[PDB]
Chain A
Amino acid sequence: ERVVYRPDINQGNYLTANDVSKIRVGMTQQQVAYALGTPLMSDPFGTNTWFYVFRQQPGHEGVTQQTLTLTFNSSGVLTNIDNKPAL
C-alpha cells in the first residue's frame, strides 16, 4: 500500500564513470587499489577477485544498483572486467 517514509541507506565506493575509464585490463591489484580502493568483498574462493558496488538508495524510492566485477589471474593479473547497471 502507501509508504509514509523511512530513513535512507547508503553504500560504499561511488564510482565516477571517469574513474571507470582510468582502468584497463592487465593491472596488478595495487594500481587497481590506487584508483578503485578497498573492495569491501573479495570472492572468498573463486580466485583473486574484486567487487565494486555503488548501491545508492534514497528513502522509499526503490533501490538503484550498479556492479563492477574484476577477475584477476593467479600471477596477480587482471583478466576480466564486468560492468552492470541495474538489471
Chain B
Amino acid sequence: CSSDSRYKRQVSGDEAYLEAAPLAELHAPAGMILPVTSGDYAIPVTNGSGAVGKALDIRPPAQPLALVSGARTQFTGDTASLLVENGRGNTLWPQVVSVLQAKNYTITQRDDAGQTLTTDWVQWNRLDEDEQYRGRYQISVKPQGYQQAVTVKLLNLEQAGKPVADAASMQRYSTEMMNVISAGLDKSATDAANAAQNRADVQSAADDTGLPMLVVRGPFNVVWQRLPAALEKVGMKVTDSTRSQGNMAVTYKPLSDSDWQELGASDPGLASGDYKLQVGDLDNRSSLQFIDPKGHTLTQSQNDALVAVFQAAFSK
C-alpha cells in the first residue's frame, strides 16, 4: 500500500489557527465607559484539556451494530449492550461461545452457570490505524427484559505496550468486539437457515390482490441466491438482477418435449420473450410473480400451471 498512514485520523488543513494571538481585552480609560459587550461572539474557556490540531482523532465514532431484526444497541461506559427478543437465554450463551470459539480468542476464565467469561488479550487489525490495539474483554449474557442482553466490557486496553485510557478507543474497540459477535450471530443464523434449506413446497397463492403468483419456501435472501440456478431448469436466462428491488428480468424460451419430462412436468405454453419478475419476503416463505413481455400478470391458469414445474426445479 505504501500509504504511510496517520493521515485518516487528523483534520484537513493547517494548524495555523492554533497559533492565533491571545484575546487580550483593553482596560478602560479614566471616567469613560466602553460598551464592554452587547452581542454574541463572547467566548467561554474550560481549559479542556482535549487533543488539539492534528493530534485530535476525527474518526467516526463506532456505533454498536444490531444485525438481528428488532435488536437494540445501547452503549455506556466501557460496555456495549445488545438486546435481542428471544425465548430462552441459556441456549444463546453457547451460540455466542460457538462464535468466539470459531474466532479462537483466548479464554482466561469461563462460567456457563453465570453465563459469563473473561478473555486474554485480543489483537485487532485495522488499516486506519498504525499502532494496533489489545483488548481484554469480559463477555456475558444477562436477560433483563425477558429477552437477553449480550454485554461486552473492555477490561484492559493496550496500544503497543502502553495501557490507554482515552475515551474514543474504549468505544471503538468495545464496539469492535461487539460488532464481531453481532456479525458472528448473523453468520450462525444465516449459515443455519441456508444449510437447513440446502440439506432438507411451491404452492399456488392469492397474494392479496387476487392476481396469481407462487409462494416458494425460504427467506428472501436464500430464495434470491437460489433463484437463477433454479431458473436454468425452467429455461429462463437471468438478464437483470436486483435484490434491493426483488426484480429480475428474463429472456424465456421453451425447452423441447424431450426436455420437459426429465424435470417431471409438462409444458406450460407461454410465448417466448423478455418477461419480468417480482420477489417478496415472507419470514420463511417468498413471493414470485411474473409479467408478460408486454407487461401483464398471468391469469390464475398459467400461474397454477407452473407450480409443478417449479417444485420439480426445487427437488433437492
Contact = CB atoms under 8 A, between A and B. Distances in A.
Q: Do chains A and B touch in the complex (CB under 8 A)?
A: yes
Interface of A: 44-46
Q: Which bucket holds chain B's interface residue count? A: under 10
Contacts of B32: 45-46
Interface of B: 32-35
Contacts of A44: 33-35
Contacts of A46: 32
B276 to A, nearest CB: 71
Contacts of B35: 44
Nearest to A42: B35
Nearest to B29: A45
Closest 3 CB pairs of A and B: A45-B33, A45-B32, A44-B35
Nearest to B33: A45
Interface of A is mostly: loop
A11 B244 CA distance: 67
A64 to B, nearest CB: 31
Nearest to B31: A45
7 contacts: A44-B33, A44-B34, A44-B35, A45-B32, A45-B33, A45-B34, A46-B32
A45 B33 CA distance: 5
A45 B34 CA distance: 6
A46 B35 CA distance: 12
Contacts of A45: 32-34
Contacts of B34: 44-45
A44 B36 CA distance: 10
A44 B33 CA distance: 7
B183 to A, nearest CB: 65
Nearest to B35: A44
A45 B35 CA distance: 8
Nearest to B32: A45
Nearest to A44: B35
